[PDB]
Amino acid sequence: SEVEYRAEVGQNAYLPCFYTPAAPGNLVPVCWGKGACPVFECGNVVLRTDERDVNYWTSRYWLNGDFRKGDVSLTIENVTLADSGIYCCRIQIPGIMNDEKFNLKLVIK
Amino acid sequence: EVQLLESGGGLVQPGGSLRLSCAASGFTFSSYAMSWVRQAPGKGLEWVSAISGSGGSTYYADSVKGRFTISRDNSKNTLYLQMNSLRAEDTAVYYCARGSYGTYYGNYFEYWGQGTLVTVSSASTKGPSVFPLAPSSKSTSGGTAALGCLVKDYFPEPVTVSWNSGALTSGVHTFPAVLQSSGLYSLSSVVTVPSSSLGTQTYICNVNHKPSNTKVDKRVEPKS
Amino acid sequence: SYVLTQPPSVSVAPGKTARITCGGDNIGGKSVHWYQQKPGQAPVLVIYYDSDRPSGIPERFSGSNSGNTATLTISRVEAGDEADYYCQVLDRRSDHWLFGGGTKLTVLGQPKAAPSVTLFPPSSEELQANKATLVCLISDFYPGAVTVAWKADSSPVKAGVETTTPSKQSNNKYAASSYLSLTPEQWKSHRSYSCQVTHEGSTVEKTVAPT
């Protein structure tokens, strides 16, 4: 089959995403969105950071981890059936192509 | 500008309860995790409790689990802390704090309030005696003359002092209080002022001691 | 379980660089933040996420974090920078916010300043209520350490003396106060009372007498 994340209506969803700062003392921008990762950026952006902190936020969506140390995992509060679908987590790594793109499947029961 | 104002602090007996409040303004309140942090006199900072933007998650330092309840009303931009079974060592200044945008936990303490003293003691409230410290013309320099107010035998801390309802600010020095060897506080407040203004200008210290719901306006006049 | 350790005190000369350590097990793996607390004031966020600087904080403040040590760095130290400094972490293992024990920053070689002393007699009103308090007010001194001794005429008084500890003013000088409690009888009996403030080997005395 294929990896997926699961939650009942009402609960919080927990979607993982990670990087390891192989060049420490330096962070990269990140963004979550709805829909599979397109060629550039993420889909309907819901949460984004610059190279320092969150510069775009949506009600119900939160970075729950130490994102400055590579935990870019996402909490979604009080989920509904509408929240089912694919989410894109994206790390802006400097270089040609580079960008780490992660599609995470959420299934709401 | 971000603003965090604590209220509800004061005196309470061991075993008793109390409810702190923190009014917030200048940001979307629901979008930010909130905390309470405290500091016993002469001691370090100690994180107490936190709550997520939505109210969905609450967090507690071990030393207060089972006793304190954090909560929030987002439709009133207000954070609360219900404190039960209070103890001696719960005595401290209680600071409200806000975390950072888009973080579930808050992560750090971006904005702080000014705090509110919570005192936990069997000792009872005592209002102050206010007395004038009349300007000695025996002890002046030029125009400069020192006059003040003595605020005697009160408990607990704190006491605020102003002059002419805050209209006189220059040359004011409100000294920190002495803790006496009776458990009572005394402090003094002094204005340095021109001598020519003595016959002219009225000098009134405004003492406020909320713990005893007492407010005193004392007129200070020259010795005969 | 996870704990933060700081050195209690750090001294530095003015214009130099101050370094305040924050120790923890692989603290490099966690975001460290820093608070400044000046005497009497609420804490202020000075640095966040190791090395970021809040809007409105001077550039002399920098931070680092790797291994077992995080470090707050303050260059061109001025006297206003005296404070307690706390490091802080979020431990998602236990869901606690942790603080270090704090570091007192002390700026050395500051200009000595002699105290001003204002001594007040008991008020008429206090006397009329069968009490008497002499009030000795000491301001604008540095370093923050003084000795108060009371005298009735020439003789020393030791009873009913209550003296505060010193404390920083706005202008980074210190203040204190001492109170002597008498009976209205004692006050009227003696010819004068005196308050002697000693500071760095030198003594200043003010005197009041029933009048």
In chain B, domain spans: 3-120, 129-220
Pairing of β A61-63 and β A74-76: antiparallel
Q: Which of residues 39-78 of A touch C (CB under 8 A)?
A: 52-53, 65-66, 68-69
How far is residue A93 CA from its own chain's centroid? 15
- At C86 the three-state DSSP class reads strand
- At C52 the three-state DSSP class reads strand
Domains located in chain A, CATH noted: 1-109 (2.60.40.10)
Burial readout B150-176 (b: 16 or more C-beta within 10 A, e: otherwise): bbbebbbbbbebbbeeeebeeebbbbb
C-alpha triplet B88, B92, B94: angle, nearest 5°: 135
Report the CATH number of the C9-107 domain: 2.60.40.10
Do residues A17 and A106 lie in contact, with contact meaning Cβ atoms separated by under 8 Å? Answer: no
Distance CA C8, CA A32 (A): 43
Question: Does residue A95 have a known ligand-binding role?
Answer: yes
Question: Does residue A103 have a known ligand-binding role?
Answer: no
User: Using the beta-carbon criterion (under 8 Å), do A68 and C31 form an inter-chain contact?
Assistant: yes
Report which secondary-structure segment, H or E, holds C184: helix C184-189
Q: Is the Cβ of B107 closer than 8 Å to some Cβ of chain A?
A: yes
Q: What is the 3-state secondary structure (H, E, C) of B57-107?
A: CEEECHHHCCCEEEEEEHHHCEEEEEECCCCHHHCEEEEEEECCCCECCCC
Q: How many Cα atoms sit within 13 Å of C137 on the Cβ side? A: 25
User: Using the beta-carbon criterion (under 8 Å), do A53 and C28 form an inter-chain contact?
Assistant: no
Which among B31, B52, B54 is the nearest to A57, CB-wise?
B31
Cα separations in angstroms, C112 against C79, C80, C146, C166, C176: 13, 16, 13, 15, 16
Q: Is the Cβ of A63 closer than 8 Å to some Cβ of chain B?
A: yes
User: Using the beta-carbon criterion (under 8 Å), do C137 and B188 form an inter-chain contact?
Assistant: yes
User: Using the beta-carbon criterion (under 8 Å), do A54 and B102 form an inter-chain contact?
Assistant: yes
User: Using the beta-carbon criterion (under 8 Å), do B103 and A62 form an inter-chain contact?
Assistant: yes
Rounded to 5 degrees, what are φ and ψ at B31?
A: -80, 0
Cα separations in angstroms, B31 against B142, B160, C96, C159: 58, 35, 21, 59
- Distance from the first to the final alpha carbon of chain A: 18
How far is residue C49 CA from its own chain's centroid? 29
Distance CA B67, CA B94 (A): 16
Q: Is the Cβ of B112 closer than 8 Å to some Cβ of chain C?
A: yes
Q: Is the peptide bond before B156 cis (omega within 30 degrees of 0)?
A: yes
Question: Does residue A98 have a known ligand-binding role?
Answer: yes
C-alpha triplet B147, B153, B154: angle, nearest 5°: 105
- At A37 the three-state DSSP class reads coil
Report which secondary-structure segment, H or E, holds C72: strand C69-74
Q: Which residues contact A26 (CB under 8 A, 6 or more apart)?
A: none
Report the CATH number of the B3-120 domain: 2.60.40.10
Domains B3-120 and B129-220 share a fold: yes
Give the CATH architecture of domain C116-208. Answer: Sandwich (2.60)
Cα separations in angstroms, C125 against B130, B133, C121: 10, 10, 11
Q: Which residues contact C18 (CB under 8 A, 6 or more apart)?
A: C10, C12, C73, C74, C75, C77, C81, C105
**DSSP class of residue C113?**
B
Report the CATH number of the B129-220 domain: 2.60.40.10
Ordered by start, the domain boundaries in chain C are 9-107, 116-208
Which among A27, A52, A69 is the nearest to C30, CB-wise?
A69
**DSSP class of residue C85?**
E
Q: Is the peptide bond before A24 cis (omega within 30 degrees of 0)?
A: no
User: Contact partners of C by the rule of 3+ C-beta pairs under 8 A?
Assistant: A, B
Find the residue in A nearest to C63 (Cα). A25
User: Using the beta-carbon criterion (under 8 Å), do B100 and A64 form an inter-chain contact?
Assistant: no
Do residues B188 and B133 lie in contact, with contact meaning Cβ atoms separated by under 8 Å? Answer: yes
User: Using the beta-carbon criterion (under 8 Å), do A57 and B101 form an inter-chain contact?
Assistant: yes
The β-bridge partners of B58 are B51
Question: Resolution of the experimental model in angstroms, please?
Answer: 2.3
Cα separations in angstroms, C132 against B53, B189, C126, C187, C210: 56, 18, 6, 7, 12
Distance CA C143, CA C107 (A): 11
Distance CA C84, CA C102 (A): 6
Q: Which residues contact C94 (CB under 8 A, 6 or more apart)?
A: C1, C2
User: How far does the CA of residue B201 sit from the closest CA of chain C (Å)?
Assistant: 20
How far is residue B143 CA from its own chain's centroid? 35
Find the residue in C nearest to B152 (Cα). C133
Pairing of β C9-12 and β C103-107: parallel
Domains C9-107 and C116-208 share a fold: yes
Q: What is the 3-state secondary structure (H, E, C) of B177-207?
A: CEECCCCCEEEEEEEEECCCCCCCCCEEEEE
How far is residue B82 CA from its own chain's centroid? 19
Q: Which among C155, C136, C134, C147 is positioned nearest to C209, based on CA atoms?
A: C134
Q: Amino acid identity of C50?
A: D
Distance CA C184, CA C199 (A): 31
**DSSP class of residue B27?**
S
Find the residue in A nearest to B31 (Cα). A59
User: How far does the CA of residue C9 sit from the closest CA of chain A (Å)?
Assistant: 27
Report which secondary-structure segment, H or E, holds B18: strand B18-25
Neighbours of B21 (CB within 10 A): 17
Please enumerate, as own/partner, the contacts of B85-89 that have beta carbons within 8 Å and a separation of 24 or more: B85/B15, B85/B17, B86/B12, B86/B13, B86/B14, B86/B15, B86/B16, B86/B17, B86/B18, B86/B118, B86/B120, B87/B14, B87/B120, B88/B14, B88/B120, B88/B121, B89/B40
Do residues A104 and A16 lie in contact, with contact meaning Cβ atoms separated by under 8 Å? Answer: yes
- At C121 the three-state DSSP class reads coil
User: Using the beta-carbon criterion (under 8 Å), do A57 and B53 form an inter-chain contact?
Assistant: no
Distance CA B96, CA C192 (A): 51
Cα separations in angstroms, C66 against B118, B119, C46, C86: 38, 40, 19, 17
Q: Is the Cβ of C21 closer than 8 Å to some Cβ of chain A?
A: no
